[PDB]
Design a protein around this ligand. Structure first.
Ligand SMILES: *[C@@H]1O[C@H](CO)[C@@H](O[C@@H]2O[C@H](CO)[C@@H](O)[C@H](O)[C@H]2NC(C)=O)[C@H](O)[C@H]1NC(C)=O
Ligand SMILES: *[C@@H]1O[C@H](CO)[C@@H](O[C@@H]2O[C@H](CO)[C@@H](O)[C@H](O)[C@H]2NC(C)=O)[C@H](O)[C@H]1NC(C)=O
Ligand code: OLC
Ligand code: OLC
Ligand code: OLC
Ligand code: OLC
Ligand code: OLC
Ligand code: OLC
Ligand code: OLC
Ligand code: OLC
Ligand code: OLC
Ligand code: OLC
Ligand code: RET
Ligand code: RET
Lengths: 296, 296
């Protein structure tokens, strides 16, 4: 298939490589297999599943709400490019140091992850403003992706350093994401809405926590997983991080909207001691408009 | 210098290239010159100037205010990498399609540009919140950089399409940036503060507008400019977009702070008809707390 040189001869007892002078770049490292047919087959099935589910999610959202639509749109464009050019440059970058870097994946993260975090910063959909903490979440997450991409493009100690820089940015992201989910839990009404927020937190930390594990295991790290193997793992946590998380987030916004139509927007101030934070909780009746504090 | 193959022999009347089987990648396209010694010399001088000015800006900011510090820090790290590894992968990506892509530049844009726009969304430094429009500015600017980077990595019609996708994201960014500067102008006190905001708008639109022009002229476009030539142009608009803009922005925040200490925080509602928008203007005396409308 390749649009780099794939035909060569070994000469002088394997010490010389001769290639056609046809303008193409050449490197042995680029011709290593991407994995077994079973790994490839598994990857093509999960991709169709993700494309189908993203199209179902899109039509379903088509009946504010813009973050779920933007991510599902990017996911669709991603699949059409994978289907036609998955291993064509620059969906995969084949670089002079011999690396294969899945630019398609990192570009998708730069497009979708900040939007997931904007959604996280307004889980109820009622806020018209965003605090200073939202800005730190976005700046830390962009840095994480930039350091991780740089680590994947590098080798040796340069890779290790940029990976560690990504991990420090990532920890700052996780820490601040955790505070938002804690605020969200004490903001939404007392019943089912707190089940969904709890569900979204589990999906978020498990799926986002898997990305650094898949990096270390993949060709970008210790080469335990092949390229197809890494694709299979990444589409699974894509389904959790994007499709399932967005579905719950959409459901949560529907429940908040139904609550406000039936009961109106009645708030109670709750205080969170763990640091001193203030949150305006939604309640069901006017017997609550007080100043409560919940110790963690 | 290179850590790709630079030694080869032409055989069979220039129709065959033979190289050592030493594990290195090889491509003729990678060995094209980066430019003249004069272009290189010009580029090394402007880089020292930018590193020195970024260090002066850092010490000066060292006497909220975090956006100027974050950008000046990234600029410093950028210079230490340029000084030691400017043309080493992956500061430059040498890819299988023959392209040289200055990943160092695009990674810096992903780190600094969103932070410049967060600063723009709070020019006075008094806001504790950010509106919905801030989020569209950040999401549009990230997309611009992602499409532009993808265009630089591509060739032929693929490059043209991703460039046009960047231009559409970019126009949305410029349009929304223009509204913010219009709001900022009618928000800050009537004298010198409105001169600085006007100055920051000119710096912003001229320096940001030059990036797509330098893309079209550089190796990523029609190859009018060489690599050193493109570096020289980019450090100039870096000085305008980052160093000079941040300096004015810091100065503006100092003037707003002095105004509020001497006069207190007294606001007047002004309305902007061009769409109907509301802005809380800072004034000097209590004879103003009314509802004015300024027709554009
Ligand atoms: C050609 O190079 C090959 C390298 O594979 C040489 O073959 C090996 O020679 C070494 C001796 O240093 C043995 O230890 C290996 O068992 C050999 N075979 C293999 C498969 O590695 C070979 O000797 C060289 N021929 C000449 C004429 O120099
Ligand atoms: C070797 O290839 C070269 C290609 O440069 C041939 O040289 C040219 O031959 C063409 C004829 O098709 C002329 O139009 C050019 O003027 C020649 N010189 C140059 C500098 O381009 C050469 O003929 C080939 N030799 C053999 C034995 O096939
Ligand atoms: C907060 C999220 C929770 C999850 C946290 C997960 C922790 C994983 C840490 C591993 C550090 C080990 C260093 C990893 C460096 C990877 C780079 C690499 O593989 O280097 C290649 C090597 O130089 C040649 O084979
Ligand atoms: C809003 C900001 C104001 C400034 C706006 C600036 C307008 C520049 C537009 C040019 C379009 C022309 C198409 C550009 C495509 C570039 C890709 C290219 O050079 O293609 C290489 C070619 O395929 C092989 O040589
Ligand atoms: C999960 C993906 C669907 C199930 C696996 C499909 C597949 O590729 O099966 C190959 C077969 O098991 C050969 O070993
Ligand atoms: C979102 C990011 C996109 C990744 C880039 C995907 C771009 C795929 C380009 C396909 C390609 O290589 O084009 C060659 C051409 O079709 C034959 O001449
Ligand atoms: C660990 C690296 C530092 C994390 C990257 C920098 C985070 C951005 C930052 O400092 O933002 C603070 C802002 O005030 C939020 O409220
Ligand atoms: C905290 C204060 C700011 C300094 C932080 C990191 C310096 C290292 C930057 C990373 C450069 C790596 C390049 C390389 O290893 O070459
Ligand atoms: C602007 C950079 C400083 C002035 C140009 C320095 C330089 O490189 O001059 C080369 C000389 O002009 C040879 O033609
Ligand atoms: C901010 C983005 C960084 C760009 C990446 C710059 C990283 C420069 C790495 C230098 C390199 O190529 O390292 C080789 C090594 O020093 C010899 O074995
Ligand atoms: C032209 C491409 C579309 C621009 C990229 C999408 C912008 C993001 C968006 O739609 O954000 C709207 C948000 O509500 C802001 O207030
Ligand atoms: C507006 C509604 C959304 C569709 C927008 C763009 C489709 C084209 C996506 C870009 C794919 C380019 C890849 C290529 O050219 O191959
Ligand atoms: C839809 C795709 C998602 C949510 C992707 C998320 C990606 C990350 C959270 C990446 C995390 C990384 C680290 C924490 C450090 C090492 C480098 C990364 C980029 C793999
Ligand atoms: C400090 C560096 C700055 C402010 C860089 C800004 C970069 C841009 C505004 C890039 C703009 C582009 C377009 C509008 C479309 C084509 C692709 C880009 C990325 C060159």
């Amino acid at each position: 298939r390749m649009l780099f040189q794939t035909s060569y001869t070994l000469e002088n007892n394997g010490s010389v490589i001769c290639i056609p002078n046809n303008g193409q770049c050449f490197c042995l490292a680029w011709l290593k297999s991407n994995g077994t047919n079973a790994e490839k087959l598994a990857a093509n099935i999960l991709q169709w599943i993700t494309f189908a589910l993203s199209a179902l999610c899109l039509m379903f959202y088509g009946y504010c709400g813009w973050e779920e639509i933007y991510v599902a749109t990017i996911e669709m464009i991603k699949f059409i490019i994978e289907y036609f050019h998955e291993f064509d440059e620059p969906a995969v970058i084949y670089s002079s140091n011999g690396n294969k870097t899945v630019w398609l994946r990192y570009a998708e993260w730069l497009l979708t992850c900040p939007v997931i975090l904007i959604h996280l910063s307004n889980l109820t959909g009622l806020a018209n403003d965003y605090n200073k903490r939202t800005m730190g979440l976005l700046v830390s997450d962009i840095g994480t992706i930039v350091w991780g991409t740089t680590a994947a493009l590098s080798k040796g100690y340069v890779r290790v350093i940029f990976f560690l820089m990504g991990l420090c940015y990532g920890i700052y992201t996780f820490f601040n994401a955790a505070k938002v989910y804690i605020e969200a839990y004490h903001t939404v009404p007392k019943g089912r809405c707190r089940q969904v927020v709890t569900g979204m937190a589990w999906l978020f930390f498990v799926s986002w926590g898997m990305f650094p594990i898949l990096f270390i295991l993949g060709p970008e790290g210790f080469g335990v997983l092949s390229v197809y193997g890494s694709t299979v793992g990444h589409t699974i946590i894509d389904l959790m991080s994007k499709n399932c998380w967005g579905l719950l987030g959409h459901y949560l916004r529907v429940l908040i909207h139904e609550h406000i139509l039936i009961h109106g927007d009645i708030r109670k101030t709750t205080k969170l001691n763990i640091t001193e934070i203030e949150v305006e909780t939604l309640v069901e009746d006017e017997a609550e408009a007080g100043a409560v504090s919940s110790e963690d």
